[PDB]
Design goal:
This is part of a larger assembly, with chains A (226 residues) and B (225 residues).
Chain A: H1 3-14, H2 27-47, H3 61-67, E1 71-76, E2 90-94, E3 99-109, E4 121-126, H4 130-136, E5 147-153, E6 157-161, E7 166-175, H5 207-222
Parallel strand pairs in A: 4-5
Antiparallel strand pairs in A: 1-7, 2-6, 3-4, 3-7, 5-6
Chain B: H1 3-14, H2 25-43, E1 57-66, E2 79-82, E3 96-98, E4 107-109, H3 112-115, E5 128-132, E6 138-141, E7 152-157, H4 162-167, H5 192-207
Parallel strand pairs in B: 4-5
Antiparallel strand pairs in B: 1-2, 1-7, 2-6, 3-7, 5-6
Helix pairs in contact in B: 1-2, 1-5, 2-5
The chains are: A alpha+beta (226), B alpha+beta (225).
Keywords (chain B): Virion
Function (chain B): Forms the tail multi-ring barrel with ring protein 1, ring protein 3 and ring protein 4.
Subcellular location (chain B): Virion
């Protein structure tokens, strides 16, 4: 559906300007509720907390086709220099700043101590801070040629603790969706920092689910004190 | 295999990964070292069997001449003894003290009781004998005054405490391994799965048991607190 179609279908579903009691919303509130429904729906779908689907990020073809247009892949070889880490062999990499959730994450190693296993594609294992001290010396769960431990820290950084030097950092995440803004907003207003019109980037299948969730959100908004 | 691999296998079987765990790796080392001797006795005490090379360890000792009792003239001949206390061997393997070369020399490791009376045979008056005294040191005895010049020996046996004999481990070519976790655990692989099973069974029940958790000047275990 297009922005015109979002607006028209949304008005039809709310029975705006009908003879029965109804709700009429501005295009700004339509944008607000559509965006809120979009983000709530896709977070619930990623976490698997939506009862109607009850399915996780890539657990069926339905969810694949819903959130296929948010997954972006990122590479980086620049290491942030001045930071304090929990290990001498700890390197820091900057996050693309539009990430929500990291789903795949990999590091490539370039060390002369790796023999003929140079450039070994090592899995990045996110580890809690309880496990770190006892995982540093773990030979089965600690850093190795086939394992890298990643810890999240402030300023959107990723502390990669590795036994060997890390040259590159490959990662695949769910990206910020473009908000659903049905009209170029006046000066001052914006949704997620966007002021002009902005079409939903997901597949058309989930647009109607977003529409009904937005309608329910609007009804709750106007009928939470009555 | 090393102490680290066995320790972390036990820990991962138990999933004691958090630093805020009641049972630390030290419990694991203690249980492993005791259950090793337990299994070795259970397997190699009933009837005599071949002992592999994995069950053994070599300690290196530095010998010092000591009086039999004190500095008196009539207190008997002097003995050599290791500078530091020596681990207790188990009676299942092939204990041997060798002069830094396993394939040469004859230094006999015998019982404490036997070494009271040795060397009276005229053909055995040049054989060095060894035993661990109740003092805890390895004492040397012979009728050939040349033995008192001996300065260094290495002792290969299935020692009853892997930690003690590994701490007394001989210097390697690269150098000494400071951390015990990086040294090699003394057991055959065919006895490793049983050892892990026994230790994991030993700590599985205690792992999920309740604690006296309230700080209230009270015993809270009867209430399953």
């Amino acid at each position: 559906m297009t922005n015109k179609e979002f607006s028209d279908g949304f008005s039809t579903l709310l029975n705006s300007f009908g003879i029965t009691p109804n709700i009429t919303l501005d295009e700004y509130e339509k944008s607000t509720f559509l965006t809120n429904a979009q983000e709530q729906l896709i977070i619930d779908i990623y976490s698997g907390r939506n009862i109607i689907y009850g399915k996780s990020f890539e657990q069926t073809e339905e969810i694949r086709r819903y959130l296929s247009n948010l997954v972006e892949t990122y590479e980086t070889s620049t290491k942030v220099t001045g930071k304090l880490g929990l290990s001498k062999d700890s390197v820091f990499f900057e996050i693309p700043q539009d990430t929500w959730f990291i789903t795949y994450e990999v590091a490539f190693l370039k060390d002369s101590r790796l023999g003929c296993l140079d450039g070994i594609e090592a899995s990045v294992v996110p580890l809690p801070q309880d496990d770190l001290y006892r995982a540093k010396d773990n030979p089965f769960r600690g850093p190795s040629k086939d394992r890298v431990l990643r810890l999240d820290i402030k300023s959107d950084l990723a502390e990669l603790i590795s036994k060997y030097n890390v040259d590159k950092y490959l990662m695949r995440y769910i990206s910020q969706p473009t908000p659903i803004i049905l009209v170029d907003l006046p000066d001052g207003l914006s949704i997620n920092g966007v002021s002009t019109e902005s079409e939903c980037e997901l597949n058309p299948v989930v647009h109607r689910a977003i529409l009904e969730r937005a309608v329910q959100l609007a009804i709750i908004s106007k009928t939470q004190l009555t | 295999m090393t102490y680290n691999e066995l320790i972390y296998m036990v820990l991962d079987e138990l999933k004691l990964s958090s630093d805020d765990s009641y049972y630390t790796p030290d419990h694991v080392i203690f249980l492993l070292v005791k259950y090793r001797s337990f299994l070795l006795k259970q397997r190699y005490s009933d009837i005599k069997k071949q002992i592999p090379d994995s069950d053994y360890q070599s300690i290196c000792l530095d010998l010092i001449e000591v009086p039999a009792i004190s500095g008196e003239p009539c207190e008997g001949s002097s003995y050599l003894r290791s500078k530091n206390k020596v681990p207790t061997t188990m009676m299942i393997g092939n204990p041997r003290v060798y002069p830094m070369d396993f394939y040469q020399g004859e230094i006999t490791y015998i019982s404490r009781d036997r070494m009271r009376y040795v060397g009276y045979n005229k053909f055995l008056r040049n054989i060095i004998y060894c035993s661990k005294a109740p003092d805890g040191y390895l004492y040397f005895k012979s009728w050939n005054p040349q033995f008192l010049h001996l300065e260094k020996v290495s002792f290969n046996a299935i020692f009853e405490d892997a930690k003690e004999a590994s701490e007394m481990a001989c210097p390697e070519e690269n150098g000494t391994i400071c951390k015990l976790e990086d040294k090699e655990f003394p057991i055959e692989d065919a006895l490793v799965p049983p050892l892990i099973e026994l230790v994991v069974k030993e700590l599985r029940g205690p792992e999920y048991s309740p604690k006296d958790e309230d700080n209230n000047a009270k015993d809270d275990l009867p209430d399953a607190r």
